[PDB]
Structure formats: structure tokens, C-alpha cells
């Protein structure tokens, strides 16, 4: 997709796997 | 077959709605 | 939900609380209307302790299920066993029939020895959990403990009147249950109801007496009851009500939550045998149920009617067929035990399940005849042998407790050790097939406390009293802390670099805000349930979502206020999609919900075909004005791996080894040119050697789980040094015959893996020191460089690059609209930027760029096929000079050739590929091989070989070996010259900025640029790699990504994203409009 190597706002595993809103809309 | 046969089928499936 | 076969209302188990433990004690409650037993939550509810009931008589044994289903067995003599094939339940009573007592073996070895000789004890084995029922002095069998095969016991404590007063889970916590008189006693009901559960203590014995009215208690859950004893409210760990129920004669007629969900029910008769006749959902669908002799028709508020068909009576009734809203009919077949053995989709494809023995299943057969055998031990009932569709077998060896000590797969054997006395099922030592050994440590909650990898680096984890992760330590000692509210929701995430995230939730537990320490946050608005309604980012942009009664997204509004429409058929399948620019696509499906046709905005229809397993088999791309109709055929292996991808111009064949690793990938072009990439793998499926066509083989030196520490190409050896996090910190290159290293590249990393400093020292004297600066968001806000001018970056609140200020130069300011479209110098509705950088852009009906006119008069025409792939372009310069280029692609949309016609002279360049990475550029008299770093698109080194066209007999030999899927022998290689090796020296993003030869000198140097990735140069063919995965086309000036073409002068792609809305709201945006932070390697 669009990997953000430096930015950890959304590409970081901790920052994206801990978001319930973004982790529940996937399916 | 006759051993451990319930008198009613489980309601797990199918399910409709919420 | 409502079970149309029976007409009853079922509420599946809802976990009120589940504190972490080796065997977590989940306090799950469920409701079934047909259940007539009046429990501690009213009629129809089941709770822990009162879920499963056991009755033993002199003539029969009855095991009442959680749902109240009476499973009948013959008389259970002491020591006897009973198996329920239909229910997969094992019952064994303790004691002996009179003979010599023997220790229980097989599936009964996990029970304690004292329980085996107790005549008044019965063990129930439901799956992997053992239930201990003990007969009490009043003659009622009630659950005493629920232990697994590892011995984690969940004691249940009963008192007088048969009340479950206390529960002690496997982690030592003590739970106290409080009962109060809620209604007057009647027949079959004493009136006592469970008014809540108290976490009495976390360790040690529970207090002897607990006063329910005493303040300061820890109420994990609380319940409210009406005057009739029906459960009307459920309260969370706090005082907040989270569930509300309404009852008519002890029948659930309305359930929901405060806000969010509200469902009402209507019954033909208010009794346990009554059936739901109408299910009204607030803001959703109202369903009406009509019950026939052997079918149930479920009408809908949208007019859809679904028919559920069933056969049999009593407990043997099974759901046999399903006729959907459009008449599609799915059928199910059952064996004599009621287990599912066949399943036919609406197209007629049948999935079989052959069962044998007491394991209930041994083989499943796909419609494409793909068998997944699964052998289970006859005595212990545990998995022993597993075989997939390619006849690859996994063999499990187990110890006395059923723990898989060794797992023997197609690639070596993995060995497990269980050396923790407290937790005999947690592995404390894992040895991979390659031989690397990992060590694990566990705490009293059964959670991972320390992980030591193969290299000896230790990851540590910390938990609170309730088993929630609150601190993580990496091998470098960087802490990642977490904060939780009493409800257990994550409200704070402090990262290793000091950046802290804070989360907010509504009453329903849905996430509503994600904020940083800076202050700017993203807001979430929700509609009904988990249906997102609005997302507002830090920059003020909003994505509004509109849903219909069926919960289907019918409109999407982007930041510019432009709507994208969606339409659906009776099966909730997208049949029409209008984009933000008016591009309308229509879809067609067969009976099995498979996309078989897709009409696009220009009226051209693409038809799809599938094999028996549902995988894509062929795509019939329609003919366009500049390309003929083409058929792309795909063939798959039984396990789902791609075997071939045929097209009109290329035939890609994939060959796999006995393990499934991609061993050979051969690409045979239509004109006979063959390019093959061969790999060798270790026991972990990590590439060890790679041969890219006729280039010299590349040997990868890896340790542990594939961490690269060396590379060998020809006479050149690369060496990598890594830190405790296995991040590269030093890189060397040495050539045989030279004492000194060709270059040394040292790197320093920020706590979150961000590159902080880098220093490159070539042997020729080129010194490149680069220092990186980041802000609180992790955005690169500055680069200190001694070879190139230092640059300072500015970003808006939305994360887009606003300006870049090189030292001693004018700033390059960029302006965007709401949606993220660059504005030269209001908005671009439809996301089609028709004027930027002094150029006029013209798009076709499908959004592809078909015309670019510059200020000087330069004209660039683009032509596409029916797959939206650029197949022909014409470029006219201001000097009245023309240029024509044609491109060829394989079935995977990878550009395999480039034919550029200029002044009547035709030059052809062929490209070889290694998966998604382009690794060859076959010119007329030169083969240029690019080797990328493993597992990424960062170029590592380049190989150049002088070559000549292959003789006709050699081409036939190459095609022969390609057909059989075997690599060409090294003795038949052509007369290629000695390979010249050059090394890529990339920046933080993997964009090559320098190119060094075998003597440490510089061959190519590129000045960094914001959107072009490199300042324009006279000869872009000397080094065509820009960004990651982009190839600079010299003839047109476009950057070829994997799937699309990128406009360097516009900072956007020339065509819409093939993924559509899946890629993002803007189909043309590149790298989130932050080319200094992100990249698109596959162009998606």
C-alpha cells in the first residue's frame, strides 16, 4: 500500500494495532 | 446413533438479524 | 438473533468480564427463548456454574446443555464411558465396576487421580475442557471444577440452597457472587437472582464475609431485575448500564443498549415453545417470519424473501437448504449423526467432508478436488498428522499432557520444550528447523513475560493485576507503556520516543478520538452499530459515510464535499459504483456471488471466469481503439499458489519446491525471449542464493529468521552489521584482490526505527554525512547534508508536504485543496488535476491521462488498453521532432518490454521481474541486472554485462527448460561478458542518490528533489530508478510504478488506482502527498 517508514502515526504496528476504531472496521 | 442424542437441535445455526 | 429453523430467539454468550489467567474464567451469559429453566438471571439465561446440568438415574443419564437441550445417555455405571457422536461429548463416571482399579489413560489421563476412584464424580469432556460434576448430599450433580488438559483448575464453590457463592480461577483470583430476593417464589423458582459479581481478591484466600452494601467493593458486573424477576439491566465494572431488556410473560420482546442498538420482537404465543413472528430493528431491517411445515420464509422490510429449508424432527432436524432473495439455492447434507458432510453452493459446486472414527472428521474435499486430510489419535483424541492439498504432511509428537513436543513438517522439525512447573502447557524453549532456539518466560497469568530470540536478544513484557500489558521493553531497553481505564479500554499509549497517544470512547465502547501530545486529533462519529458515519482528521477534512437500512454504504463524501454513489442488489452485492469524478462502473455476478462482468465508464465490459475452487481463471479484457481484445489466463495449484499466468505477450510459470517456496519463476515472451529467476531456500523459507537470468548468482548470508549479514556477488562481498533490534548499522563492500573496503556506510537510528544519522565513505574520497531531524509527529522536518544543500520541510496538519527550503535557494511551496489535489500558484472536484506546473492535462472517461500539453507546445498522447495499462504513447517536441513508444505487459500487469520508435529507428528494451521487483533491463547489447535488498524494493547493487542476441537453437533450449520448470544449466549460458558491479547508495527512503563502481569511485550522482526524487538530468537512462519501485522512462518522462505511471511534475499518478476506493479516497494521490516520508513501491 503506502508504507510510512519514518512516520509512526499510522504505519507503526503499535499505533495501528491498538486503534479499536481502525481495528474493527476491517471486518 | 441413539446414544447421546439431544431432544432438540442447537440454535447456533442458522441465525437471522440481530 | 432469531433461529428460523426453530423460531426461537438466541442471545449468544456475552462476556461480562474475563480477567487474564492460564485458563481464563470468562463470565459469559446467554439467552435462549426455548429454554424453560429459570436460572439466576431469570428464565432462559445460562451462567457459569449453571450452564451445563447432569442428572443420573438408575435407568438413564441425561446431560442438559447450556441451551437446555436434554442429551440422553444410557445408564452410566461407575467407571463407564459414554460418547455422544452428535454432540462430541465424552462422559465418564468415577470409580470401578468391581475389578482392579487402573489409572485412566488416553483422553482421561488429565483428570486428577483422586477423582477417578470417586463413584459420586462424573467427568464431562467437551472439546478440550473437562467438567467435574460431583453428587451432593441432596442428590444434585453440580459443577465443582473446570480444568483443562494442562491442569488449570477453576474451582466452583457452592453453599446451602445450591447457590454458586464463589469462584476461584486458575490465576488465584477469588470471585464472590451476591444473590438477593428479586421476586416472590413460585413453582420452579425460589426468587433469588444474581445481583452482581465481586472480585473478592487477587491472591490468597477470599475474605470470610463480604457485605454487599459496604462501599469500596470491586463489582465486575451488576444486574437489575424487574418485579417479576426478569433481567432488565446489565451494568459494567462502573455504574453505567450497558444492556437493557424488556419482557412479556418472561419472553424477551426488546433488547438493546443505551444508544446504538435497539431490537424488538413479537411472538405468536408468549411461551418457551413460542416463535418469533417479527423482528423490528431500530434504524435497520424489520423481518417477518412465516413458518411452514418444512421451511421458514423470512420476509424483509426491503421486500426480500429468504427461504430456509430443513428436514427431520426432534433433535435430528437439520438445516438442509437456503433459497436466497434472488432464488439462489444452497444445499447441505448430513450424516447419521447430524454432522455436516456436504455443501453445494448455488452454482452446484460441492464441498465434501469424509468423517471416520471418533474424531468426527478426517478429510475435507474442495470442489476442485483439494483434500485436507486431518488424522487424530484414536485414544487421546488429539491431532497427530495433518496433510494439505499438496500432500505435504505435518506430524505431531506429544507428551503425556498432550503438548506437541516436536512438529515434523515438510521442512525440518520444530521442537518444543515445556519446562515451567506452574504452566505445563506453555512452551519455554522453541527450536526452529534451522536450529535457532528461542526461550520464553511466562508469569502467573499465563502470559508471555520475556522472549529471547535466536540471537540472545530479550524482549520483556509487564502486566498489571488483571493481566493487561502495561510495559514492553525491547532489547535496547526502550519502553512502550500503556494505560487503561477501569473498563479495560486503552486510553493511553506512550511510545519509546516520548510521543504519547490518548484515546477516547463513547458509552458503547466505540473509539471516538485519537489524539497526540501536540493536541491535534482525529475524530470518529458512529451511526448504528459499528457503521462509521464521519471521520475528521487533524487538518479539518471530513469523510462522511451514508448507510441504508441494510447497513450498506450508499454514499461517500470526501473532503471536497463530492459524493460517491453505490448501489446494491437483493444479495447486498455492489452492482453499480459512481466515483467522485462521475466514473460509473457496473458489476454482474453469477449465482455464487462471483464477479463475472464489470462494465466501465466507457461502455467496455470485462468478463471474468473462475475454476472449481473459486480462483480467478481468465480475464477477457475488451478491445480498445489502440489495443486488441486480450485474454489473460491463470492456473493455480491445489493449495492456492499461482502456477502460471498466461497472456498474449508473455507466459509466466512458477515452480515451487517440496515445501512451497518459489524455486523458479520463468517468463517466456511471445517472441521467444526467456528470463528466469531461480532461488534456493533454507529450512525457514529464506532465500539463500538467487540467480537473476544470466547474471552471476547472488549468495545471501543470513542468520536467525532471515536477518541479512552478508552478500556474495562475483568477486564482491558485502557485510552488514546489525544492532540488538536487527537493524542495519554498518555496511561494507570488499573486492577480491583489494585490501581496503570499497565503501563503509554507518547508520544511527531513532527510538522508533527512524534513521537519525548516516555516513558514507567511498574509497575514492567521497564522504557523505547526512543528519535527520524529526518533529513530534515523526515527520522529517529537516536534513543536514554536506554533499547536497540542507533542506527544511514543512507539513500541514493533514500530513501533506507544504514547503521545502533548500539552503541558499528559493522555497518550493505546495498548495492543496481539501481532497489533496495540488493547486498551482479553488478545488479540483473529481480529483482530476487538469492544470498544474504550466501543463494542461486531458483525461478520458475512465480517468486515465490521455493528453498533456506543455507551455512550450510539447504534446504527450497516451493510449491504454481495456485493463487501463499504457500500451502506446506519442510525444511531440517544440522542435518538431516526434517519438513513439509501445509497451508490453504480462498477465500480472508487469511491463515486460518497451519499444521506442525515434527517427525511424526502433530500439527495444525487455524487462525481467522477480515477483513485484523489476530485476533486469535487457538492452540490445547489454544486460543490466538490479539486485534489491531482500524483502523490499530498496536497490542494493547493479550488474552490467555485455551481451549479444541468443542464437535460434539456444532460445529453443531455454523454452524447453522453461516448460518443464527447471533452471537452465550453467553449461549452456551465452557468451556474456564479465559483469561490472555497481552499488546503490540510497537515502532514508531507498531512493538512489549515488552509484559507486568496483574501485570506490562515483559513477552516477543525483541531486535530491521533492516529487521527482532526483533533479532532472541530461541522461535519465544512466540511472532510471527513482523512489521505490519506480522506473524513469527516458522517452516520456513518466515514472513507471508497478501498476500505474507517476507524473513527477504533478506529484500524482496518470491513472486511477486499480484498487478503487480500497486504496484511498483520492485515486491519484501518491505517498499521501508526503513524498519525503512515504512511498508506493507497487503503485497502489
Residue numbers in the entry:
A (entry chain C): 1169 to 1195
B (entry chain A): 30 to 47
C (entry chain B): 48 to 872, 910 to 1168
Copied sentences from the primary study:
Mass spectrometry confirmed this observation and N-terminal sequencing identified N- and C-terminal proteolytic cleavage sites in between amino acid residues Lys47-Pro48 and Leu1168−Ile1169, respectively. One domain consists of a barrel-like structure that is assembled from an anti-parallel β-sheet that spirals anticlockwise along the central axis. The remaining two domains correspond to two plugs that close the barrel’s apertures (N-terminal and C-terminal plugs contain residues 48–124 and 1092–1168, respectively).
The T6SS is a contractile secretion system that assembles inside many Gram-negative bacteria and injects effector proteins upon contacting neighbouring cells, providing a fitness advantage that allows the bacteria to compete for space and resources. The data suggest that interfacial Tse5-membrane binding delivers its encapsulated pore-forming toxin fragment to the target bacterial membrane, where it assembles pores that cause cell depolarisation and, ultimately, bacterial death.
